[PDB]
A paper describes a structure:
The mitochondrial ATP synthase is a membrane protein complex that generates most of the ATP in eukaryotic cells. The translocation of protons through the membrane-bound Fo part, mediated by subunit a, drives the rotation of a membrane-embedded c-ring and the attached central stalk, which together form the rotor. The torque of the rotor against the stator subunits induces conformational changes in the (αβ)3 headpiece, thereby triggering catalysis. To reveal how the mitochondrial ATP synthase is modulated by lipids and organised into a dimer shaping discoid cristae in Euglenozoan mitochondria, we determined the structure of the ATP synthase dimer from E. gracilis.
The mitochondrial ATP synthase dimer was purified natively from E. gracilis and subjected to cryo-EM structure determination. The atomic model of the entire 2-MDa complex contains 29 different subunits (eight newly identified) and provides a comprehensive description of a markedly distinct mitochondrial ATP synthase dimer, including a previously unseen binding mode of its natural inhibitor protein IF1. The model of the complete mitochondrial ATP synthase contains 29 different proteins, of which 14 are phylum-specific, displaying a distinct architecture, particularly in the membrane region. The interactions between the monomers are expanded, resulting in a 45° dimer angle, compared to ~100° in yeast and mammals. Our atomic model of the E. gracilis mitochondrial ATP synthase shows that in contrast to yeast, subunits a, i/j, k do not contribute to the dimer interface, which instead is formed by species- and phylum-specific subunits and extensions of apparent homologs. The extensive dimer contacts are stacked across three layers: the matrix side, the transmembrane region and the lumenal side. Thus, despite the presence of conserved Fo subunits and the contribution to their extensions to the dimer interface, the E. gracilis mitochondrial ATP synthase displays a fundamentally different dimer architecture, when compared to the yeast, mammalian and Polytomella ATP synthases, suggesting that dimer formation evolved independently in different lineages. Our unsharpened map of the ATP synthase dimer with both monomers in rotational state-1 (IF1pointing towards the C2-axis), shows a continuous density from the C-terminus of IF1. This density extends towards the dimer interface and contacts the all-β-fold formed by subunits b and d, suggesting that also in Euglenozoa both F1 complexes in the ATP synthase dimer may be inhibited by a dimeric IF1. However, in contrast to the mammalian ATP synthase, the specific binding mode of the Euglenozoan IF1 assembly links two monomers within the dimer, rather than between neighbouring dimers.
Residue numbers in the entry:
A (entry chain J): 2 to 104
B (entry chain G): 2 to 56
C (entry chain S): 10 to 74
D (entry chain H): 372 to 424
E (entry chain L): 1 to 57
F (entry chain P): 7 to 120
G (entry chain F): 1 to 220
H (entry chain BP), N (entry chain BO): 53 to 104
């Protein structure tokens, strides 16, 4: 005797709203992270807040070591690898003189 | 790229452990497992009575 | 003449009951393989950062770096 | 024919044993497809002499 | 204290925890539904249609 | 609107506390002990202790365990390890220069951040 | 390079710790099913009972499983997960919040979009002028020169429609925060008392003994 | 907090058979009354271990 | 505190539980029936004493030679 | 206003249309209520000189 | 004449070992080693003592010099650091923030 | 009583060292090695590794 | 320590993802798919 | 704290036979009332012996 239990997960999912609930849960959680936690925490411009003792207490099991700066040297190694893979000139950025929006 | 630095590789020895207090060990809830394993085993295997003869 | 409301099995009748039992008890079998793997994964683990660490383990997921 | 094996001392799986009750096996499989494992008021309505029992 | 932190509010590690948990739940739903009720056994055993015959005499 | 539902006995509460007392009675039944080999240090008044006469029950269940009675004790040497290392550390002699340069978890250390 | 916008994801022990939570569900086998059946049949009667029932069962059993692993199976994430606010707001509260909107979402959505056409509810509405006002003018109320302020009206009516769906969110957040605070503060206070007692006994080794007992205190 | 359990005691002393139906309202009466104390305790612990 | 339905495990009707299989003619095989097949080590205890001695001694020899 | 109360999803259509047309400006207005009283700097009007480049 | 793939008695005997587990049979039997060699008792003490030890080392002596020294003097200095951390002379002998 | 039996058991142990060694050699060459033997040998190797560390 | 019990240091590594590069490769994959399929503008794809 | 023992007193004074079934509630309530006082005490002792 035919059953979606043993022959179709798609029709089983469609015929049961209580199977849609976890999927909507997942989508909402990922959307929440995308909207709020992505740019504020995970971006390189917003990653130094994990060194804060108020907003990220003991994220590194201790107070953050600023004399060592593991974040700085890790990311510097990665940017150096990017620069070597792209064969970009380091000193080309220093030859730029941006204008001002006068008036 | 992927990395595997040597800073994570450090010496290890149980001699350097500070350890736990008597209170922390009691709060670790091992003694509760110690008692309740036997409790639940006893309840399960004592619910099922076998046949017998009354003497 | 045969008895009514009876027929031979077909592919859309799904698997047999013994096969459904063999499907059911596979998680129970993988339990014995995964709980020791859980304990080994916890016991053979090392922390990733220290006060002296100049580097942190990086894992490029898509090889973009 | 199934009970003959049980009398020989052979262990029969629950679902192997259910396959030898085909009409109940079908309705039981459909109750599983629907996903309602509750029971009892259906019995108390189809057989009102069992109500409260 | 450590848990009093805005970083731990939208923790992506716990979001991954929830994701993997409910994906596995979705995968294993058809095994959770595989419990047998004995109601149709009862209906088969106890349902007795009227078997008396008609006799005008 | 006016359904007129009869009382359902399954919704009452007349079995939970009896069942809990049955479980507790099953627990306390394993505290029964013989007179031979019995000893319990009473209080200075002569009155019994609280935790004292409820150790036999716990250890009678430990008797029935299988793995915990052979595993959960392996965290106990660590207590004596701490007892010894603490006493070593209460009077450990240290360098004054290193203590003034690198105090452990001291406040207002700019190398930490605050 | 300019186009490279880099993001750091903090990844830890998730896979092997999340697998055993689902694998334990075969062992628990939904022991809370009878309680939730009783409560659902107390609170509502419809064909879609089973849906919401199953949902609540999943949520509750996950909570129970995580709690028991937090009490017993103490490794890595199982300790923090109950002391963390993200779990109490998104792993338990969000599912219960969205469950009725997933079961009876059709009716609630239709209700809300009808409440945007805000009107006074009359019992035994045998009135004719009510109907003419509702069709011609759109509402029982006077809608003269509200188009002049329609820009705010839309959103305000939207809030006016969901105001009776908002206290559910409020109560979910309140009780999630309550559970987080309860776990965190009770654990912290208990550990603090333990550490002060151990400091007293380490400084007085006549008392640094198993003074209550090895199993007595632990069992209690 | 203690008012709730005192009430449960005296209510069961008036009617022991009802002690099972009121016991939910007894536990219900504790965790709520206890909660505000915890919230009162939060600020003082929020006051020290984060602020410098 | 909890209703009688929750205590007894059923709302209306107590469902029959299939009993446990026995497998006549052989021992039960469960997580708790394994000492029938695996007792505590009893065959090579004296070899254990000897090998522990020899292991300690050989390790001490090579460690002292390495250190020196 | 009389199409809003019609059946066939016309309440949803009317509400969403009101949103898409006027409710966005209403959201902006609500955001600007706490902006009207606030000190703001002069607008750095574009000189419209940067961007021109001959084709080749 | 069974038309299905009949499963042998020994195969059922083996599968019964896997499906006849109870909840306590999993919980306590796997929780005792976990609680003993876990983040609470042994592994936690080890891995959280290491952090304080190497913080003290990198503050007082340096990680490079520590790596250059011998394993014996390394362990001695680690033990001294462990004693300093367990003592916690600056926290009033209390492991709290 | 234990001291007398502890002393008296030393000849048995020293006699059965060679006996157990010969049976282990025979079982490895013949291949007739079973589960209980494997468990005892694993216990042996654990204790030997511990005493190796101790000897170091 | 209690805070040490209220701490989660079970991390393993940092997954670094250049979302700019990933967006670029996504757009390139979309272009490649649309070119290989030779799909028209009116397609739902 | 004393409100719980007073409640148990009056409860047994109205129904002596129920004294055994309410004693567990009595001990439970004493501990909970006493714990809040004990929690309040932690701040006072934590306020002095560590902070400079
Ligand atoms: C009337 C307008 C009402 C629509 C409201 C709306 O939000 O629409 C935009 C909304 C997303 O637009 P957007 O995020 O602002 O623009 C960026 C693109 O999505 C950029 O993504 P894309 O254009 O490359 O992908 C196009 C296509 C490709 O689709 C596929 O590739 C199929 C595979 O479809 C999608 O990917 C769906 C949209 C993107 C994902 C869902 C929305 C993201 C919200 C923020 C993050 C949430 C994380 C969700 C995590 C989900 C779990 C993994 O689209 C949808 O979510 C549903 C679109 C349904 C279209 C049906 C049209 C049929 C009409 C007959
Ligand atoms: C299921 C479980 C349930 C729970 C059950 C309970 C379990 C109990 C668990 C207890 C575990 C914690 C106990 C504490 C151990 C802490 C280990 C640790 O990590 O810290 C290292 C810690 C480092 O301390 P430190 O700050 O660096 O300074 C230490 C030195 O002062 C200066 O530093 P150093 O590095 O230069 O050291 C100098 C030297 C100490 O300098 C000396 O004073 C030299 C004298 C010691 C050697 C004497 C050997 C000869 C003994 C006589 C033999 C008599 C029998 C002969 C037959 C006679 C026939 C009539 O160090 C030693 O010798 C260390 C002692 C090691 C044992 C003896 C040497 C054998 C090593 C080779 C292993 C051989 C294996 C034997 C077979 C084992 C079978 C199980 O070193 C020690 O632990 C040594 C302290 C003494 C041992 C602890 C005794 C406890 C405290 C006082 C006694 C209270 C109990 C008395 C009961 C009666
Ligand atoms: C003594 C500490 C435990 C006493 C009470 C606990 C107890 O005996 O439970 C039985 C418990 C388990 O029974 P089992 O199956 O006979 O264990 C195998 C023996 O450990 C296997 O070792 P064994 O006892 O048969 O003989 C090994 C031999 C090794 O001879 C040596 O080469 C050591 C030389 C030292 C100088 O050591 C001795 O017999 C005496 C020298 C001192 C050790 O055995 C022990 O714990 C006693 C030996 C433990 C020694 C290392 C502990 C760390
Ligand atoms: C927008 C254009 C609507 C034109 C109109 O008839 O507008 C009709 C409405 C008045 O309609 P009612 O009197 O029926 O409420 O005008 C307004 O609400 C003000 C719109 C701005 C008119 C310019 C000033
Ligand atoms: C490492 C493997 C554990 C070896 C335990 C030996 C055994 O058969 O187990 C037997 C022992 C105790 O045997 P007893 O019946 O003699 O008390 O442990 C158990 O009873 C259950 C062990 C469960 C863990 C299995 C792995
Ligand atoms: C593709 C994964 C590449 C990889 O090796 O990655 C391997 C890493 C594991 O690395 P570590 O365990 O060493 O930290 O796992 C992942 O990055 C998977 C993350 C899953 C969450 C995103 C979905
Ligand atoms: C469906 C199959 C798609 C496929 O195979 O696509 C194949 C392409 C192949 O790209 P490469 O040639 O660079 O390897 O994959 C991609 O470009 C990236 C796909 C997204 C993978 C990451 C999933 C998380 C989303 C974060 C990335 C940014 C969002 C991009 C939009 C999704
Ligand atoms: C009816 C009783 C009424 C009085 C109520 C008293 C308050 C009780 C609060 C119970 C909840 C505390 O929760 C419990 O906290 C302790 C203390 O950190 C945790 O215990 C954990 O941390 C401590 C802190 O050092 C470690 O020593 C210990 O090894 C570890 O198990 C438990 O894992 C957690 O379950
Ligand atoms: C006491 C203060 C007020 C709080 C009251 C609520 C406390 C709840 C926490 C205790 C929960 C105990 O949860 C308990 O789970 C077990 C599963 O092992 C259920 O057990 C139930 O299902 C199993 C099988 O699934 C049946 O075989 C059994 O007959 C039945 O009791 C109990 O019915 C339930 O009571
Ligand atoms: C699952 O929940 C059940 C747990 O119940 C535990 C109850 O704990 C109390 C048991 O401890 C005691 C207390 C007293 C006693 C005995 C000392 C009753 C008094 C006696 C033997 C002198 C009459 C025995 C055990
Ligand atoms: C510490 O223990 C870890 C390993 O445990 C292994 C337990 O193994 C016992 C296996 O049980 C058996 C025993 C016999 C058999 C056979 C098939 C040989 C029995 C037979 C021939 C009677 C059918 C099958 C399984
Ligand atoms: C006051 O109570 C303290 C005891 O709590 C111990 C917590 O234990 C965690 C779960 O332990 C179990 C294990 C199995 C079970 C049973 C045997 C009832 C499981 C079942 C229903 C599958 C047979 C119940 C509880």
């Amino acid at each position: 005797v035919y059953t979606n239990w043993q022959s179709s997960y798609t029709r089983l999912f469609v015929s049961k709203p209580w199977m849609w609930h976890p999927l909507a849960w997942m989508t909402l959680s990922v959307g929440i992270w995308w909207k709020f936690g992505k740019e504020s925490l995970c971006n390189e411009r917003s990653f130094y807040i994990h060194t804060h003792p108020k907003w990220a207490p003991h994220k590194f099991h201790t107070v953050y070591n600023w004399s060592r700066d593991p974040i700085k040297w890790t990311l510097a190694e990665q940017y150096a690898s990017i620069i070597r893979n792209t064969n970009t000139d380091i000193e080309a950025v220093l030859k730029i003189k941006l204008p001002a929006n006068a008036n | 790229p992927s990395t595997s630095p040597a800073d994570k590789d450090v010496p290890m020895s149980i001699l350097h452990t500070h350890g736990l207090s008597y209170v922390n060990w009691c709060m670790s809830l091992a003694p509760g497992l110690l008692v309740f394993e036997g409790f639940f085993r006893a309840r399960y295997y004592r619910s099922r009575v076998p046949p017998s003869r009354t003497v | 003449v045969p008895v009514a409301n009876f027929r031979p099995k077909k592919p859309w009748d799904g698997p047999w009951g013994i096969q459904i039992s063999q499907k059911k008890d596979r998680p129970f079998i993988a339990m014995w393989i995964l709980f020791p793997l859980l304990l080994v994964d916890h016991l053979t683990r090392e922390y990733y950062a220290y006060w002296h660490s100049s580097k942190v383990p990086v894992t490029d997921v898509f090889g973009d770096f | 024919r199934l009970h003959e094996r049980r009398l020989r001392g052979d262990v029969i799986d629950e679902w192997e044993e259910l396959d030898y009750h085909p009409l109940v096996r079908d309705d039981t499989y459909l109750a599983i497809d629907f996903g309602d494992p509750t029971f009892g008021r259906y019995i108390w309505k189809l057989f009102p002499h069992t109500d409260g029992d | 204290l450590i848990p009093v932190s805005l970083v731990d509010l939208i923790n992506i590690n716990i979001i991954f925890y929830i994701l993997l948990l409910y994906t596995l739940l979705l995968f294993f739903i058809p095994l959770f539904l595989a419990s047998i009720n004995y109601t149709y056994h009862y209906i088969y055993k106890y349902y007795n249609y009227n078997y008396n015959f008609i006799n005008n005499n | 609107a006016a359904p007129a539902e009869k009382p359902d006995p399954a919704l009452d509460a007349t079995k939970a506390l009896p069942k809990a007392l049955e479980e507790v009675e099953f627990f306390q039944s394993y505290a029964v002990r013989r007179k031979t080999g019995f000893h319990l240090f009473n209080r200075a008044t002569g009155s019994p202790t609280i935790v004292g006469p409820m150790f036999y029950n716990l250890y009678n269940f430990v008797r029935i365990g299988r793995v915990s009675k052979y595993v959960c004790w392996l965290s106990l040497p660590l207590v004596f390890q701490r007892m010894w290392m603490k006493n070593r550390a209460t009077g450990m002699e240290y360098d004054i220069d290193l203590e003034n340069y690198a105090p452990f978890e001291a406040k207002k250390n700019p190398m930490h951040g605050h | 390079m300019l186009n490279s916008n880099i993001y750091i994801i903090i990844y830890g022990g998730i896979i092997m710790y999340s697998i055993m939570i689902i694998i334990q569900m075969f062992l628990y086998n939904f022991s809370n099913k009878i309680y939730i059946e009783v409560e659902i049949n107390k609170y509502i009667l419809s064909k879609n009972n089973i849906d919401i029932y199953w949902i609540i069962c999943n949520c509750t059993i996950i909570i129970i499983i995580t709690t028991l692993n937090h009490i017993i199976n103490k490794i890595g994430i199982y300790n923090m997960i109950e002391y963390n606010i993200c779990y109490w707001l998104i792993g338990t509260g969000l599912g219960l919040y969205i469950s009725p909107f997933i079961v009876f979402g059709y009716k609630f959505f239709v209700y809300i979009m009808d409440l945007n056409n805000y009107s006074l509810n009359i019992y035994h509405n045998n009135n004719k002028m009510n109907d003419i006002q509702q069709i011609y003018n759109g509402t029982n109320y006077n809608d003269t020169m509200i188009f002049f302020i329609k820009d705010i009206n839309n959103i305000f009516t939207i809030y006016r429609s969901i105001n009776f769906f908002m206290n559910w969110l409020y109560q979910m957040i309140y009780y999630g925060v309550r559970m987080w605070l309860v776990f965190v503060l009770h654990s912290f206070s208990l550990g603090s008392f333990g550490e002060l007692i151990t400091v007293i006994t380490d400084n007085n080794l006549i008392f640094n003994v198993f003074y209550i007992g090895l199993l007595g205190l632990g069992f209690i | 907090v203690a008012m709730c359990f005192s009430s449960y005691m005296l209510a069961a002393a008036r009617q022991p058979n009802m002690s099972a139906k009121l016991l939910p309202y007894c536990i219900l009466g504790f965790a709520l009354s206890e909660a505000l104390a915890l919230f009162t305790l939060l600020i003082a612990l929020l006051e020290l271990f984060v602020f410098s | 505190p909890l209703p009688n339905a929750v205590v007894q495990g059923y709302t209306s009707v107590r469902g029959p539980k299939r009993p446990l299989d026995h497998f006549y003619g052989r021992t039960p095989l469960n997580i708790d029936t394994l000492w029938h097949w695996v007792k505590f080590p009893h065959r090579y205890d004296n070899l254990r004493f000897a090998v522990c001695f020899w292991a300690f001694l050989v390790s001490a020899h090579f460690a002292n030679k390495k250190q020196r | 206003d009389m199409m809003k109360v019609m059946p066939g999803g016309k309440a949803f259509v009317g509400t969403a249309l009101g949103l898409a047309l006027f409710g966005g400006w209403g959201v902006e207005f609500v955001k600007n209520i706490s902006v009207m009283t606030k000190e703001k700097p002069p607008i750095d009007w574009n000189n419209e000189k940067l961007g021109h480049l001959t084709r080749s | 004449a069974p038309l299905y793939p009949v499963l042998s008695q020994a195969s059922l005997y083996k599968r019964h070992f896997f499906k006849n587990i109870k909840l306590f049979h999993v919980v306590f039997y796997v929780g005792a080693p976990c609680v003993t060699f876990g983040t609470a008792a042994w592994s936690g003490s080890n891995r959280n003592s290491r952090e304080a030890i190497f913080m003290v080392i990198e503050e007082r002596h340096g990680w490079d010099n520590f790596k250059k020294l011998s394993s014996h003097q390394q362990g001695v200095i680690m033990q001294e650091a462990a004693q300093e951390s367990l003592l916690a002379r600056n926290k009033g002998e209390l492991h709290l923030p | 009583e234990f001291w007398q039996m502890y002393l008296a058991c030393w000849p048995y142990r020293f006699r059965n060292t060679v006996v157990e060694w010969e049976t282990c050699k025979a079982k490895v060459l013949k291949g007739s090695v079973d589960l209980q033997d494997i468990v005892d040998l694993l216990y042996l190797l654990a204790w030997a590794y511990l005493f190796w560390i101790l000897g170091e | 320590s209690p805070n040490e019990h209220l701490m989660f240091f079970d991390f393993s590594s940092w997954l670094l993802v250049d979302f700019g590069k990933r967006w670029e490769r996504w757009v390139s994959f979309k272009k490649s798919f649309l070119t290989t399929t030779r799909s028209p503008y009116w397609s739902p794809q």
